[PDB]
Design a protein around this ligand. Structure first.
Ligand SMILES: C[C@H]1CCN(S(=O)(=O)c2cc(NC(=O)CN3C(=O)N[C@](C)(C4CC4)C3=O)ccc2Br)C1
Length: 130
């Protein structure tokens, strides 16, 4: 229905706003762009599902997220990919992991404060009906 289409359009506006607020935070600058393949050629071999906030925006605009749960799976993926590629005790790796964990925690905290549980539930029930 047009009412269901209006629901998913509201979800996209909400997800763009959350992603924008993460992307303008100076802590998260590294996560705003895909890994430069000329700068880091082995990334695409080690990390099987690369994800970054620019790709998250692309996926919102392509209607790939029908629930906030599906969006948070991609936020979780930025965090897990960061922990996987940068696992060492050195401060460079530890800073990336702390920033990755913070990006994930911030996304979940915004959604906890600002997502209506009944809105997510409606998205889930429209998704399941298809
Ligand atoms: C190579 C490491 C860096 C951190 N991780 S990550 O897995 O946490 C990760 C990185 C990225 N994007 C970028 O790194 C984009 N970028 C570059 O390719 N080079 C510069 C200029 C800078 C890094 C030297 C930069 O910012 C996106 C997502 C993750 Br999860 C991979």
């Amino acid at each position: 229905s047009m009412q269901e289409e209006d629901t998913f359009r509201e979800l996209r506006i909400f997800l763009r706003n959350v992603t924008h607020r993460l992307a303008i935070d100076k802590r998260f600058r590294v996560f705003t762009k895909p890994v430069d393949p000329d700068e880091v050629p082995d990334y695409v071999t080690v990390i099987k599902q690369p994800m970054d906030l620019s790709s998250v925006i692309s996926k919102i605009d392509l209607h790939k997220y029908l629930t906030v749960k599906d969006y948070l799976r991609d936020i979780d993926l930025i965090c897990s990919n960061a922990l996987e590629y940068n696992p060492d005790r050195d401060p460079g790796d530890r800073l990336i992991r702390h920033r990755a964990c913070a990006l994930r925690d911030t996304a979940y905290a915004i959604i906890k404060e600002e997502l209506d549980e009944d809105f997510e539930q409606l998205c889930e029930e429209i998704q399941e009906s298809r």
